[PDB]
Amino acid sequence: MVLQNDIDLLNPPAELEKLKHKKKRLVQSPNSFFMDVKCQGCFNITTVFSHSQTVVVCPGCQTVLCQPTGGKARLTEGCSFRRKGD
Amino acid sequence: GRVRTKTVKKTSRQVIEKYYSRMTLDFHTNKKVLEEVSILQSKRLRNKVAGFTTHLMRRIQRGPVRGISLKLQEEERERRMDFVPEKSALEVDEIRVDKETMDMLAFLGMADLPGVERA
Amino acid sequence: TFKRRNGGRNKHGRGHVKYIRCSNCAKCCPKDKAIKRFLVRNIVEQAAVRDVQEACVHDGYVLPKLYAKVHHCVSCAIHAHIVRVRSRENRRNREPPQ
Amino acid sequence: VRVSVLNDALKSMYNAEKRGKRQVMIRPSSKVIIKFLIVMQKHGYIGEFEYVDDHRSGKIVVELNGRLNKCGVISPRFDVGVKEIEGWTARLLPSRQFGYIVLTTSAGIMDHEEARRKNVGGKVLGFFY
Amino acid sequence: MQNEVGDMVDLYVPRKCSATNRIITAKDHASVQINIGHVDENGLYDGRFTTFALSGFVRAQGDADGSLDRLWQKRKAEIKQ
Amino acid sequence: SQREQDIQMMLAADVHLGTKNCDFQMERYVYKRRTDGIYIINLGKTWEKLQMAARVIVAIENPQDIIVQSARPYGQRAVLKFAQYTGANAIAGRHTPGTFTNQMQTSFSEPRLLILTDPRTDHQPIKESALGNIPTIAFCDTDSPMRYVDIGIPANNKGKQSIGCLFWLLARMVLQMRGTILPGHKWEIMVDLFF
RNA sequence: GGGGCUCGAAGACGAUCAGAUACCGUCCUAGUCUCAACCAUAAACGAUGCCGACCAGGGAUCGGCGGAUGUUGCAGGACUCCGCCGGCACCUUAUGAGAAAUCAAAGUCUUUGGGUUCCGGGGGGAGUAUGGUCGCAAGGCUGAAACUUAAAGGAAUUGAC
Ligand SMILES: [K+]
Ligand SMILES: [Mg+2]
Ligand SMILES: [Mg+2]
Ligand SMILES: [Mg+2]
Ligand SMILES: [Mg+2]
Ligand SMILES: [Mg+2]
Ligand SMILES: [Mg+2]
């Protein structure tokens, strides 16, 4: 790792930017995503933010899904998580 | 005191370096050899040199020292070239490979080397 | 001429630190600057432990320890040989002895 | 605060050049920075450089060829006529044989020799040699 | 450099480092020059070599090894290996 | 020979092991780190790095001014040979300061190339070669400065097998390049390994 | 105004000393604590104004976050490993700077220009005189001149002590 003389700033390695700060990447990108949380029962289509801040509910039993924390929302053990993307 | 001047130390080292063949353990033999193999003016300087040479023969009869050379083990060469076994110490089979080295051999190297092991 | 990088004390990121009093002269010295030692010793020493062993009523009595954290000002510490004056290059050596 | 992005760009480029780097990154980019780099490249003091669109201000990645000794801005942007160029040449440049002063004239951003050719004046952006 | 006649006027033309392009001064005693020999298809040294020069600055930096390795990888492509 | 044989041999000789850490150099040579913190330095790059070193050292046809140095008392045996297999000279153990700068010293000998067992151990010859335009080749490990060494082979210098096997492999390919070793096999069964 | 343990300017006494209104002992007043008001100074120091960019490496640590990990008389908490941001520092080394000590900023400075505030011009007289102004006062802020002087001073070096 002599210095950037060996790497190319234009085409940097695709995994080293998976670890840098989002602002400090070559092009700024969010670190979050949106996920459609599926409860144990029906009504499995609700969409929630990864770094959510509001305690979302469900139409059935209000089925508390996530708790807001300092980072990613604390999903419950009973709620299944899969992610939706662009 | 009884410590030896650099001159007598040096001359003792040289006479042992070039005349280790015949010189013996007794002090009087050492001095009677010194008187003709080298020119020393003071008789008591010669006695000091002979006694010092005797002391270094006592030192060397147990093992080599850091002072003298020539015939460079003590008197005979060929000490370590004879340490050549009929088989090389380096084995080629099941040669000391771990998980990360297995991942390496999955990289540019060949994962089917003869010495690959699951350790 | 600045003899030491830290100024002889151990203050960074703060402005005030309460003092203590030297155990020999009772001189007010900042807590971080004072030479602090922790000495732990038997109440009775080797010449005494032998004579107190048999004098003890029961053999199961372990001899009690004593622990004391003492603080010294620079003058008292130097005069009592707690810390000596070191050479210029050895001054930076913060490694404790042994 | 960032009061002159041109100074930051030139200073980062010069610092990277002194350290023997082959590429340098400039952030944020701007049109005047691009024009200054274009002049420097045309005269043959740098090489390739590419602008990266980050949708906010853009970055520049510049390829160095080791030919640039010094490059730096002049602040504030003093106004120079055609008759004063010589004087500034005697101040910012090593010798009359080479070196360049960049002027932002109303005909665009150019060097001082081109300004004398077109007989136009303006403000002084920086210099490089 | 060049006179109006078109002749040399300086005593000599210096070497410049093959990594950082900065020139090598006559009193630069950390500046070195390496000849890397080439081989044939069997692996026989043929008597010809590629020459590189490194200035004292790049050596003292500690990037001499990386720069020389990169230079060799780049240069061997034209002349095969 | 074929790279596979040399790679498997240095695998046997444990030349791929690193240390608990590395400097900001040699990440071009490491492969990753084990969970214990050791490094697994990629022998593949080491192979053609020492191959290019061999290309370098058979280029001057006057092997007299090539001193191999070894300050550590563990690789002295390897440096003892590689000086009569080739024409290189070799100073083992102690390197008196002034042998590259003091022209009145009895041991004054200015080379055209230096070979060093480890840049950390004998740094004094490195610093002295910096004052004479002496190109330098060393077998750097992780935690070894790149300060003046010009060609650095990423190997181990703390192992009985690593040193010795590595030196023999270098000398073997150097003799191969010189042409003395026409396509054949080893006639120098491991002797340099420590007694 | 209250409180007033301990310690202790002033004061007294003992001791030492050629002398001791000092250092050492003892008893102590204002003070040390608190409430309501004044003062506006410190070696108030990192003797290093604030904002911004770049330029070597390393490990430790504090706060938050992301990932992996396999133990806890118990998802989470404690511990281990990797990474990001922010902070107090530390170690090695100049290819940098500097009169040097030394400094990773005190670097990117005759190849001199990112923005901005304050502030110095040989040593004394002197932070003095006077005027102005704030304060109950002690004092604070602003602040000269005549005259005198060839050195004063900083860092490092060798001796001597
Ligand atoms: K202290
Ligand atoms: Mg002093
Ligand atoms: Mg703070
Ligand atoms: Mg304070
Ligand atoms: Mg003040
Ligand atoms: Mg943490
Ligand atoms: Mg004055």
From TrEMBL, chain A:
Protein name, as recorded: 40S ribosomal protein S27
Entry cofactors: Zn(2+)
Keywords tagged on the record: Metal-binding, Ribonucleoprotein, Ribosomal protein, Zinc, Zinc-finger
Signal peptide extent: none
Short name of any one Pfam family annotated for the protein: Ribosomal_S27e
Family (UniProt): Belongs to the eukaryotic ribosomal protein eS27 family.
Gene3D superfamilies documented for this protein: Zn-binding ribosomal proteins (2.20.25.100)
GO cellular component term, pick one: cytosolic small ribosomal subunit
InterPro entries: Ribosomal_eS27, Ribosomal_eS27_Zn-bd_dom_sf, Ribosomal_zn-bd
Gene name per UniProt: LOC123098530
Cofactor binding, per record: Binds 1 zinc ion per subunit.
HAMAP family, alphabetized: Ribosomal_eS27
Biological processes, Gene Ontology terms: ribosomal small subunit assembly; translation
Provenance organism: Triticum aestivum (Wheat)
GO MF, one example: RNA binding
From TrEMBL, chain D:
Keyword terms of this UniProt record: Ribonucleoprotein, Ribosomal protein
One Pfam family of this chain: Ribosomal_S8
Keyword Ribonucleoprotein carried by entry: yes
Highest taxon listed in the record's lineage: Eukaryota
Keyword Isomerase: no
Function (record text): One of the primary rRNA binding proteins, it binds directly to 16S rRNA central domain where it helps coordinate assembly of the platform of the 30S subunit.
HAMAP family hit by this protein: Ribosomal_uS8_A (MF_01302_A)
Protein's UniProt name: Small ribosomal subunit protein uS8c
Automatic annotation (TrEMBL), chain E:
GO molecular function terms attached to this record: structural constituent of ribosome
Keywords for the protein's UniProt record, in alphabetical order: Ribonucleoprotein, Ribosomal protein
One GO-annotated biological process of the protein: endonucleolytic cleavage to generate mature 3'-end of SSU-rRNA from (SSU-rRNA, 5.8S rRNA, LSU-rRNA)
Tagged with keyword Transit peptide: no
GO CC entries: cytosolic small ribosomal subunit; nucleus
InterPro entries: Ribosomal_eS21 (IPR001931), Ribosomal_eS21_CS (IPR018279), Ribosomal_eS21_sf (IPR038579)
Keyword Plastid on entry: no
Pfam families cross-referenced by the UniProt entry: Ribosomal_S21e
PANTHER family (alphabetical): 40S RIBOSOMAL PROTEIN S21
Family: Belongs to the eukaryotic ribosomal protein eS21 family.
Name this protein carries in UniProt: 40S ribosomal protein S21
Gene that this polypeptide is encoded by: LOC123097498
From TrEMBL, chain F:
GO cellular component: cytosolic small ribosomal subunit
UniProt GO MF annotations: structural constituent of ribosome
Keywords, alphabetical: Cytoplasm, Ribonucleoprotein, Ribosomal protein
Mitochondrion among keywords: no
UniProt superkingdom: Eukaryota
Record localization: Cytoplasm
Family: Belongs to the universal ribosomal protein uS2 family.
Subunit structure: Component of the small ribosomal subunit. Mature ribosomes consist of a small (40S) and a large (60S) subunit. The 40S subunit contains about 33 different proteins and 1 molecule of RNA (18S). The 60S subunit contains about 49 different proteins and 3 molecules of RNA (25S, 5.8S and 5S). Interacts with ribosomal protein S21.
Function: Required for the assembly and/or stability of the 40S ribosomal subunit. Required for the processing of the 20S rRNA-precursor to mature 18S rRNA in a late step of the maturation of 40S ribosomal subunits.
Name of the protein this chain belongs to: Small ribosomal subunit protein uS2
Organism placement in taxonomy: Eukaryota, Viridiplantae, Streptophyta, Embryophyta, Tracheophyta
Residues of the full protein shown: 12 to 206 of 304
